[PDB]
From a paper:
ChdCs are enzymes involved in the prokaryotic heme biosynthesis pathway mainly of monoderm bacteria, but some diderm or intermediate representatives also use this pathway. They catalyze the hydrogen peroxide–driven oxidative decarboxylation of iron coproporphyrin III (coproheme) to iron protoporphyrin IX (heme b). After initial oxidation of coproheme to Compound I (two-electron deficient reaction intermediate), a catalytic tyrosine radical is generated, which is completely essential for both decarboxylation reactions.
In this study, we designed variants where another tyrosine is introduced at the site of p4 (W183Y). Also, we succeeded in solving the crystal structure of the W183Y variant, which allows evaluating the steric restraints around the newly introduced tyrosine residue. The structures clearly show that the introduced amino acids occupy the positions of the respective residues in the wild-type protein. While the distance between Y135 and Cß-p2 is about 3.1 Å in the wild-type structure, the Y183 oxygen lies about 4.4 Å above the Cß of p4. Both single mutations leave the active site and the overall structure is unaffected. The introduction of another tyrosine in close proximity to the redox-active substrate leads to approximately 11% nitrosylation on Y183 and 50% radical formation on Y135. Compared to the wild-type protein this is even an increase in nitrosylated Y135, which can be explained by a hampered reaction and slight accumulation of Compound I* in the variant.
Author numbering:
A (entry chain C), B (entry chain A), C (entry chain B), D (entry chain D), E (entry chain E): 6 to 235
The structure:
């Protein structure tokens, strides 16, 4: 099944939204009821798996919450994404802020490196996601040297096994090359990990890694809706 | 044929639009029939060729659908684009997000390399479109050096003959040097072509290649109007 | 007369406007008349010369049409510019998208390179306008090296005598160094010229050259107002 | 006690807000009371410490005031932030401009350097806040060279002991690597510190340090509320 | 007195506003009366010196007029800037586009160089304003090499004594290092000065110098308010 985990087809999308001030109002029970119904429908249809919903309040301006859903076919995420904005009031009073799309593929050298979500691990309580673009010369570099740099890079994170990684290619799914998501039970551990990873030779082959989206996984839509601005 | 295909004048435009939340309303039957009537007119007139309409739902924020159409004269694309915005409710309740214009020309060295749309090939079910800007030294470079880089570049895509390429100059038709479009029966094949094309010396002569637009070709206007947000 | 031309004082402005969807409507005859009446008063006063009005439909998002007008003193352009927005409906229902200002000066080495509008040449049916910023090391370069670079640059355009050039300084009149406009009877002639001009050593001393505005010169106001979105 | 401060966990957020014209109005006695009462709540709950509220009028377009508050847990900053926008009129008539989050950590080589707020010092009357991002080769630089570079960096600031420094890591809490705040009783001593600090080898390892936020600490909510635009 | 001129403390701000179409209207007589009254109160108060009001119509999109005022303390500019926005109808129907703040300081090597406003010279009828940022290596450069580079810089400007300079530090007051303003009786003399300064070695140590704001000093508020779009 290790071969099946590498040959698996899974599209992953991070859908970031911002709240429109003055749109939600103070009465939100129907919005909550209609929204939880939509997600109940996704779950029983068995096609789009919602890994988490995250309260992004306080991370950045122009972003409030985010959905992380996965599916075998991208056209499934298109329809769920479209139906959310079209047939739910929460989707009609939310603006789309940023979309991070990716597709699982095996690693170039160490095929034991698999995304946390590919392996069915339990999602972390805290998350940070952001895109990634490598240097222009990265992929044509001597494969022996690139393999050496990626080994020092994996070895530099040995002290953070509580932080689960998700590196997923994103070519042609947007303006980026990879899509990154890191889950942990505590935010301060993610911060510490990013700091340590700066001490690697791979940092000399980086072109872009913004924007960042950092938030807490909520247990149910009501926990998130009731927080948003009015 | 290959000389007349190289010599023919064809302009090509990718018209990307963004839905205005709240403008479409829930009753769209008349809006669909009117839009279909507009496209049927273009066909019978036989001046502007619509290669495809694409649902971009979930690709990026601030974009929803796209029109790809072609004409021998550019002012006929101007008139169809302006008429679409002016005389159809769909175009009235849509916002222009981005325009990618190009004009067909023969390749520098290999004159058997022609866009898939120039060769009359059936359009693919999935598409990614993005503009392109080479490095400043690309064209003044030793011509035989460029020749060699483009040949290796071409060989790196030998295993993706199901992905059909459209590389069209765009000088002075916008902010870009080339308009790129790649169509295929499956989206995953485009992601993997882009990933493979990173292993080329030509990646050292790239200045810009965003924004990306990726979507699914719809069989009819109605299929698209229905997924858009109200 | 030749040194008389190099000594002239002329300011040139490209005023690009963007239509406000929903602000115009379908009864545009009076709007067209007040607009025509305004441009008649300018020519009557004989201080501001309108070289052409241009339909940019389909060129880029957030731009619809452009005015090119010239005057000996810049304050006369400010007046015509502010009166157009203040005292004509077409100006009250349009947004300023971009302004490109310049002031004619003689060339550094070749005093017989003069802008087309300074030579009084008939304006072209198709135009492309964009700003220009040279590399930081351009002007402190050896004058003889820079002189040779400009001479080879000029020679690369020998085969496009139907494309007339306006290369005008713009220092301190905005964010750029030069303002460029290229007039031709056919758009493809402008595209082919720019592609050819890439094969010059002058491309290694370039810092900026966007945004581009390309369009067709209209015979009369009505021709433009009837294309815009209602 | 320095060992206990280094090991302290403290989250810090700068919440920059911009006023909405025509939203606040002329009568504000009730907004200042509801607002003053909100901050009174945080005081009792003893979870979120407001280090200062700053009047940013005149610093930059699209920013008017700022809140600097600290919490042991970032979830507490999330709730406080979300409650302000949701449960006070001041937060409902303002929009979020920019957010600067950080987490206090011990320094690399000199463990006696601690943020001025970790030291419990008194907030300066004037402040400048801005993010920071080092060069890509900074942390993988030979540690002795970095130690020395930061030593010179420290000696170069001996002239300004009256400006208190807060340098806090910000990895994964946004688009930046560090969050910087500099507190002083006079604004001009901050300006001179930035000017003097330009003369350091550290400046050769900088990638980004904008946007800046500079303003005056207010002694109570009323005075800030009353300078804002109606 | 020159030593007092180098030791004098003076804050300078360029406050750029943007008219709101539809917000001014036609009957602007009480508007101008109220704005002239506010500026007259400023002169009587004697703390904030208005150096000029500038008509920026036609320079750039999204900018219409500019105020240049000076004060010994920056708190007094905050007060007038806020009071203008909050209490004068003009400030209420204008948007803040950009703010340029600086603080007068002595020159590094030649203390005879002083801004034109610090010496009390009559303001010029035309102006160009823009921020400036030097290269990262500029201040750590060998002082004698920077002394020589600045001396040649100054000598390049000798052909333009009619163009008066105001180069003022802007560290910590925004996103820039210097705030530049050049006043002259003719606009074409400002363009020719910029063009000539390009022939200097200091140009190899530049990072940012945009945006520009170029306009005409008006005699009285009335002269400007009548130009604005309704
Ligand atoms: C964080 C973070 C970034 C982005 C920040 C940065 O650039 O430092 C980051 C960047 C990337 C990027 C691109 C890739 C894509 C590969 C490439 O071709 O560039 C990429 C891919 C890989 N990462 Fe990665 N990462 N990464 C971790 C976290 C981060 N990683 C942690 C933790 C571990 C260690 C734990 C684990 O293996 O599960 C780890 C290891 C790997 C391995 C396997 C290592 C091995 O071969 O031994 C592969 C493959
Ligand atoms: C994808 C993709 C990109 C953008 C990504 C990248 O930059 O790597 C991409 C980039 C460019 C760019 C610019 C140009 C413009 C020419 C230049 O001066 O740069 C450009 C133009 C050409 N491409 Fe290109 N491409 N490209 C393919 C797909 C992609 N291509 C595939 C597939 C094939 C192979 C199959 C085909 O012939 O159709 C292929 C080959 C060519 C040939 C013919 C080479 C030959 O002599 O063999 C020419 C000419
Ligand atoms: C197109 C185009 C650009 C921008 C695109 C590019 O960078 O390739 C372009 C860029 C620039 C720029 C800056 C300048 C300003 C000079 C400098 O100091 O940078 C600038 C100025 C000059 N151009 Fe220029 N151009 N340019 C033509 C078209 C383009 N030109 C064509 C055509 C001809 C030849 C036809 C004619 O003169 O009628 C031509 C010749 C000149 C001459 C005369 C040289 C001579 O022959 O000795 C001068 C001076
Ligand atoms: C202002 C300013 C900047 C941003 C501008 C710049 O780039 O110059 C600035 C930049 C940074 C940055 C990143 C860091 C993060 C460390 C690193 O890995 O880069 C960073 C961190 C440190 N700074 Fe820093 N600064 N800084 C001061 C003010 C500024 N500082 C003043 C004042 C003093 C001296 C007074 C004091 O706080 O005790 C001072 C000293 C330190 C020390 C302790 C020095 C020592 O070991 O000798 C550390 C650690
Ligand atoms: C215009 C213009 C720019 C921006 C364009 C450019 O980058 O070339 C411009 C750029 C800068 C910049 C930064 C600084 C800040 C100092 C530094 O470290 O960069 C800066 C500061 C100085 N400027 Fe400057 N300028 N500048 C003039 C106009 C311009 N200047 C004119 C005119 C004169 C001629 C003096 C006169 O008024 O009598 C002149 C001379 C000086 C002197 C005096 C040097 C001396 O000792 O001889 C100092 C100090």
């Amino acid at each position: 099944n290790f071969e099946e985990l590498n040959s698996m087809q899974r599209y992953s999308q991070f859908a970031v939204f911002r709240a429109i001030p003055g749109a939600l109002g103070s009465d939100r029970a129907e919005i909550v009821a209609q929204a939880q119904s939509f997600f109940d429908g996704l779950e029983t249809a068995g096609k789009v798996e919602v890994r988490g919903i995250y309260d992004l309040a306080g991370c950045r301006a122009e972003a409030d919450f985010m959905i992380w859903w996965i599916a075998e076919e991208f056209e499934e995420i298109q329809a769920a994404f479209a139906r959310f904005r079209r047939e739910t009031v929460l989707g009609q009073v939310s603006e789309v802020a940023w979309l991070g799309n990716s597709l699982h593929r095996p690693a170039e050298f160490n095929r034991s490196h698999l995304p946390s979500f590919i392996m069915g691990e339990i999602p972390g309580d805290w998350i940070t996601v952001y895109p990634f673009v490598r240097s222009y010369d990265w992929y044509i570099m001597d494969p022996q040297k690139r393999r050496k740099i990626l080994a020092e890079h994996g070895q530099a994170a040995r002290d953070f096994p509580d932080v689960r990684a998700n590196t997923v290619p994103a070519f042609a799914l947007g303006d980026y090359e990879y899509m990154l998501a890191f889950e942990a039970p505590r935010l301060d551990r993610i911060v510490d990990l990013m700091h340590k990873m700066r001490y690697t030779e791979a940092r000399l082959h980086v072109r872009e890694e913004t924007p960042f989206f950092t938030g807490r996984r909520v247990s149910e839509v009501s926990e998130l809706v009731n927080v948003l601005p009015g």
